[PDB]
Structure formats: structure tokens, C-alpha cells
Amino acid sequence: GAMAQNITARIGEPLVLKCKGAPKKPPQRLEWKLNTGRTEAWKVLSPQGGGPWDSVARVLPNGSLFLPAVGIQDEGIFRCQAMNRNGKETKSNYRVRVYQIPGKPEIVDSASELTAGVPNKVGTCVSEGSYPAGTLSWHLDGKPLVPNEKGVSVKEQTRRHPETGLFTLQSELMVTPARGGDPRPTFSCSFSPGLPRHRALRTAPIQPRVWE
Amino acid sequence: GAMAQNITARIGEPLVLKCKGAPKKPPQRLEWKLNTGRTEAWKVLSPQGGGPWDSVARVLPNGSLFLPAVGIQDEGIFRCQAMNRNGKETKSNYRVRVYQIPGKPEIVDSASELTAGVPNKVGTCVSEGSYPAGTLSWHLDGKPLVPNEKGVSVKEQTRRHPETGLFTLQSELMVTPARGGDPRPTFSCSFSPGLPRHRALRTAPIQPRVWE
Amino acid sequence: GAMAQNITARIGEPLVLKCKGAPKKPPQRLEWKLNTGRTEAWKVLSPQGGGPWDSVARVLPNGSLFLPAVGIQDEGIFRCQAMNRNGKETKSNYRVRVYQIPGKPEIVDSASELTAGVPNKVGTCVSEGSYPAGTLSWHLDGKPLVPNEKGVSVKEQTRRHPETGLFTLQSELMVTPARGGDPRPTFSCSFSPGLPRHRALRTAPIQPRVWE
Amino acid sequence: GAMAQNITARIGEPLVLKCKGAPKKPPQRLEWKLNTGRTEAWKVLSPQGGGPWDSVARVLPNGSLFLPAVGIQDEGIFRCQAMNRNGKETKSNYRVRVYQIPGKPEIVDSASELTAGVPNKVGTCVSEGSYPAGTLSWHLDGKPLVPNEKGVSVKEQTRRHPETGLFTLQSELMVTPARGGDPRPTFSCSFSPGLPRHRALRTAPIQPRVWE
Numbered sequence A, B, C, D: 001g002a003m004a005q006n007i008t009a010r011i012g013e014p015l016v017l018k019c020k021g022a023p024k025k026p027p028q029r030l031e032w033k034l035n036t037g038r039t040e041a042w043k044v045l046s047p048q049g050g051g052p053w054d055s056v057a058r059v060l061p062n063g064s065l066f067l068p069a070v071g072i073q074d075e076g077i078f079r080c081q082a083m084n085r086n087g088k089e090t091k092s093n094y095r096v097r098v099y100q101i102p103g104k105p106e107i108v109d110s111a112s113e114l115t116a117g118v119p120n121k122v123g124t125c126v127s128e129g130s131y132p133a134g135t136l137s138w139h140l141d142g143k144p145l146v147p148n149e150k151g152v153s154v155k156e157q158t159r160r161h162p163e164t165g166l167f168t169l170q171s172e173l174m175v176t177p178a179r180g181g182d183p184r185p186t187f188s189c190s191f192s193p194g195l196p197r198h199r200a201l202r203t204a205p206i207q208p209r210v211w212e
């Protein structure tokens, strides 16, 4: 596509997008065009408005576009073209990505005892309510656990809420502690969001006993 | 995929799917699996139910699956496996396609007079509220008009309702009447549904005057 | 989207799209924009060309866009804007849908004998190589058979060729002939294409014997 | 979906998936089912093989599934069910995600001089050939630069190669240096892959002069 300003909008919150170069107040020669999950290709929106789109996105007095409550289907491209009172045309191009932050992740069915030298289920980490899905990862004494490493096995599951579309993730960790290891290792699980610069969320740690 | 019974479900109406081979009343060893626009791959539903799926699809006492009001996102595959009291396992496989019937199509901005030998806009046909989109087509005195045949030009547009997802179609017909033709031709437009065996809907005819 | 000329392009064949209002020969101030399965939103193509797109779609000397061999991923929207030598700007807007015609459909595993009053497998109809998928339907003595009617059952299956993406459809018909019916009914199966105004393809008929 | 082992497969490389619990050599009672970008819902593959799938994925003598060169369309779910010689059934469930590593990112059109207190284009970072798209981000003297923080503006662009589907990303950085800042700041850009645990790639730094 073209060069755009990246916008991240939290699901359920309002979004205002500026129409650069629009006069401060009506009358304004400007048009918004959007291509999102709601549209078939481009939809044009104008300051006059009208119709079912008035429930979803409306042009404000200063020419900005306003969505009262962003949904998953509002992901897409939003563009404005405006003429100021001198006749200069200015374009605005936005790429809108939407997100939701899950609840704090939790470890369920954690083991209190592990046996060295054999596979053990350590626990299941669960995160509910993310968009985009994001990922779960396990840590041992502050270091990432890698499933490709020997003695670590992970299985993962993704589900969607049938009404909101938000993701629930589940990650089951199994480990084979090596003979002579730490008898009280500390495990935790982290949720890493799908979008850049969003912070990870971490579970409370667990500390099983390992039997030699 | 596998062999399935095809099911067409009107948006907004309930749907009941039979679990073949299930005992008539509980207790029943049966499981439903669905893969639809609501799910990430397969979701399992059981007679006990529970959780947010209880608002969307529930297993009934006789083991059938019930959706109180089908939506676009319920398109997909629905499967049951049941054991009867004899121990025999029976599988049911359904492919569910959803639809909505638009309002009767209308011709707007129809021309009252055409001039022979030059291009004329005849009118614009509009259909609102279909799923899947379907198509619009023009007829002249009961015969289909085919674009790219000489003297016929059509342009078409598709939009979606931002909240319901249903389609609005628009079709603009232009013709070049051939000299010596009928001075009072009769045009109409028809909506053809996307699914098989659904009936076409037709507009009232228009009858412009052609000037030689 | 906007009003467009609908274009149907057969997979594997060339496609030429006219840039209306472009000068007959270079130099030309014109630009093509396309949004297809190949692109992330709009891609701009110019008479100079260059790069990997030169293998897929190139602007010709008269300004038309040329694709030597259309694929499934070329479905989408193609637009031109040109200035003629007088300074007038002209826009062209095309909605391109692609298709492939399957081989003639065939009935396999047809029954030679049916028993009245009980369910019988009549046969399986198969169509290979369509795009979009299209549908199969059964006919009895020239009349459509409807699965919603008593004594008719149909199951259907869709597969895709892993390399070409073209669809293979299969339809299995079962019937319960009513006591006292025709002892030599004639069945056939028809493939109905997904796009409008494309012709159906029909199998050779079968003529089982029915036992009272 | 169900619990699965997550598998990451580099585009263009072979992939082997183990059928757990299968006998070491034929004969084997086992079946693979796949649902990927190539399939309509599930496709069953068997040790005998045959047909066009033999060019894409084949069952090996030990029952493993083999793809000689993974493509984007092989993303999806791969499952095996096998019986050993004892009669025990074992299931294997894999979620396959595909990727490609882009070339090292580069900064083009970097500025040699910036002026304090006014917006300046610093440069454009470009990464070619990734899957999934991934993201570009700017750093100043080793610290992430965050847009929407005062004096930082970023615009971004995504394109796809028309034949391979791989992504090219472009990111243009503008900054307003604050008066009294470092006259020789050091900027760099990093590519962050879409999949977890894949390493970032970084450009060579640039060091413009800032004029007070």
C-alpha cells in the first residue's frame, strides 16, 4: 500500500483521526475513505453523513473522523483528502490496527512434585481476552524455556470467544529435570502481545520440589 | 472435506441440527464439533454445555444442536458423533451456509426518453439486504441483456451494511438503441441469489420512449 | 466500492484492460492501481514498469494493462487514471473475477437396480477443475430433484487441487422410489458455474430399473 | 482448536512430521489429515498415496509426513492417527506456521545534517523478503524511538512480492531535535520477526550532524 501513519486502537474505546489540512470549522471540502472489515473495498464518508454509517463513524465539526467504540471489524485503512480555504489539498493516510489486552495470565494444574530424569507436567498457563492472539512462553528461574531444547516439551491451544472474537490461549509445559539439578526450580509464564511495544504480562511463579 | 449434508440457514432464524443415532433422551454419549466463523479450528460442545457458547449453540435433550438466531459467522461445518444404547457409533456431518433475502429490487433514475443511435442511461437497479451478495441483471422485453454485446454497457457497485454485513447491489444500464427499433421497449432488472434453488426477484418494468 | 465495469477472466488466459482516455502512444501521463490477491492494498504500476511486476502485469504502448496468464490471485480491482493531450483526466474502474471451466461432469458408481419403497444409492456425480467452486444438482426425467423433498437425500463433498487451487465436487444421490412409479426413471447431474451467464454442463443420463 | 505441538517451518525447506505411535515400517494402520491453505477443510493422506498430493506431501516408510519444500499455503493443522502392533491408538497434532527471514535491513536516503527545533527526515529503512510481515522500528543511541512521543514521527509502508508473497517493509523516520542536544546522534533501524524467539536484524548505524 502507500505510506501511512500507524494507529493502534483498543477495542471498545473511541478513536479520533485528524483530517490534516481541513479548515477548523464548516464549511469544508473534505472526504474520508475507509476500507475495513466493515466495507466492500472503499466506502466514502462526508461531513453531511447520514445512513447506517452514522452509528459507526461520523465526521466531526473540525473534519476529524470519530468512531465511538472501535471493534475488530474496524481494522483497515482510513484516508482523508481536504482543501483548506487557500485551495491547497492535503491527504491523510492511516493504517488502523486494533487490540485488546487480556487479563493477567494464570498457571492452573501446577505440579507440586517433579521427578528428575523423567517427563513431568509442570502446569498449564492460560490467558483470556487478547486481540490479536499473542503468544504464551515459559521461563525457568528467569530464563526463557525453549521447546526445541532437550527435556522441554510444550503443547499449545487457541480458542475464541464466540461473541467477542477475543482469544484464549493455553500452554502446557512438560520438563525432564536432569539428575543433579536444582531441587526447587522456579517457573513462570508470560503473555507477549501481538502488537509492537505492548508490554508482556507475567504469571505468579511456581516452585515445585524435584526428587532425585 | 468429507461428504456432508448441505444445510441452508436464513440469517436471524433458528437452526436445529439432528445428531443421528443419539438416544432419545439423556444420558447420551455424544459430542458436537463445529468449525465456523466463530471458532479457531474445531470447538467441542457437549450435552452439559456451560460458558459463553450457551448463548450461541446448545445441545437439546434429544441431542440435537440448537442455534436460536443464525448469523453470518455461523457458516461452517457442524459434526456430531453419538453412541446409541446398543454401542453403535453414528456420525453426522453438516455443511451450513447462511443467507438473507433482500427486499424487492427497484429501478431508480430511469430515463423517460432514449435517443436511437447514441448511448443512453436507462436506469439504475438497486437491491438491499442480501447474503451472499448475489447479482443483478437486466432484461429487455423478457430477454437477458448481455454487456459486451454491442450497444449494451453495465456498471456495477457493491456495498455492505456496516452493522449487519448484508449487501446492497447497484447496477447502471446504458444502451445504444438501434435505428428502426421498438419505440416503446420494456426493461426490467432481476436479483439472482447466490445459493442454488433460491428464486430470482424482479423489478417492475419500465417503458421509455425511443426517438428515431 | 465504486461503480465498476465487471470483467470475467479465464484462468491461464491473457487479460487486456483498456485505460480509457489515454493517448494512443507514449508519452502518456497515466497510472494503474490494482488491489488483488497479489497486493497489500493498492499497488501502483506505471508505463515505465520495472521490477518483479514486469513478470505479472505490464502497461502496453497504448496504455492498456496486460497480464499474460491470469491466476486466481489476480481477482480484485484494477483502476487507471489518464490525462489526454488536452489535459482532460479520465478514470477507468474494473472489477476482475476469474474462473475456470471444469471437465464434463461424470456419474460414477451408478446403480443398475433400485428397489421401490426403500432408500437406494443412485450414483455419485463428479466434476473436476472448476473456479469458483460452482454446484452440482440432480435431475429426474428432466426435472430438478430437491433434497428437501421426501424420498430424496443428497450428500456433497468439495476438494481442491493442492497445486492449482481448482475445485473437485462430488454429489451422492439417494432416493426412495414410491411404489407404483416409473420402472425405468432417467437421472442426470448438472454442474452450474459460480459466475452469472456461464452455461451449465450435464452428464450423460442413467436409467436404472426399479423393482416393485 | 485442540492442544497441539507448534511447528515453525521455513519457506522453501523440507518439513518432516512424526506420526507418533506408528510401527517402524510398513504395513501400518495410520492416516494423516491436514487442513491448510491448500485444502477445503480436512484432506486425508494415507501410506499408499497417489494423485497430485504426491507432489506436495507424502507419507514415508516410517509413517512420517514429508513436504519437500514448504510454502505459504502449507500453514495449518496436520494430524496423524496410528495403531501400533499392540492395537494401541496414538494421535499426533501439529500446528504448522511458516516463515521467511528477510535480507539484512538497510537505511536509504539518510540525512547528513539535521536542524534542531524543526522536523527533519532522518531516513528510510527497508527490509525485503519476510514472512509473516514483521515490523520495523527505529532506535536512537541504542534506545527505542517511540512515535507520538514529542518530536518523533514515523510513516510505514508494506508491499508484497507478486510471485512469492514475501513482504517488503519501509519505515520513514522524522525527528525534531531538541535544542542543546547531541550534535552527532546515532540512529539505527531493526527488523522484528513475526514469530516468537526469532532474532531481530539491525541496520548499520547512521550519525548525522545536528545544527543548533
Ligand SMILES: Cc1cccc2c(-c3ccccc3)c(C(=O)O)[nH]c12
Binding pocket: A002, A031, A032, A033, A079, A080, A081, A091, A092, A093
Ligand atoms: C495515497 C493516498 C493517501 C491519502 C489519501 C488518498 C486518497 C483520497 C482519500 C479521501 C478522498 C479523496 C482521495 C487517494 C485517492 O482516492 O486518490 N489516494 C490517497
Ligand SMILES: Cc1cccc2c(-c3ccccc3)c(C(=O)O)[nH]c12
Binding pocket: B002, B031, B032, B033, B079, B080, B081, B091, B092, B093
Ligand atoms: C468425517 C466425519 C463426519 C462426521 C463426524 C466426524 C467426527 C467427530 C464429530 C464429533 C465428535 C467426535 C468425532 C470426526 C472426528 O473428529 O474423528 N470425523 C468425522
Ligand SMILES: Cc1cccc2c(-c3ccccc3)c(C(=O)O)[nH]c12
Binding pocket: C002, C031, C032, C033, C079, C080, C081, C091, C092, C093
Ligand atoms: C473511484 C475511482 C475509479 C477509477 C480510478 C480511481 C482512482 C485512480 C486510479 C489510478 C491512478 C490515480 C487515481 C482513484 C484515486 O486513487 O483517487 N479513485 C478512482
Ligand SMILES: Cc1cccc2c(-c3ccccc3)c(C(=O)O)[nH]c12
Binding pocket: D002, D031, D032, D033, D079, D080, D081, D091, D092, D093
Ligand atoms: C484432537 C485430535 C488430535 C490428533 C489427531 C486427531 C484426529 C485424527 C487424525 C488423523 C486420522 C484419524 C483421526 C481426530 C479425528 O478426526 O477424530 N481428532 C484428533
Ligand SMILES: [Cl-]
Binding pocket: A158, A159, A160, B038, B039, B040, B041, B042, B043, D001
Ligand atoms: Cl474456538
Ligand SMILES: [Cl-]
Binding pocket: A038, A039, A040, A041, A042, A043, B158, B159, B160, C001
Ligand atoms: Cl461498503
Ligand SMILES: [Cl-]
Binding pocket: B001, C158, C159, C160, D038, D039, D040, D041, D042, D043
Ligand atoms: Cl481438499
Ligand SMILES: [Cl-]
Binding pocket: A001, C038, C039, C040, C041, C042, C043, D158, D159, D160
Ligand atoms: Cl503490494
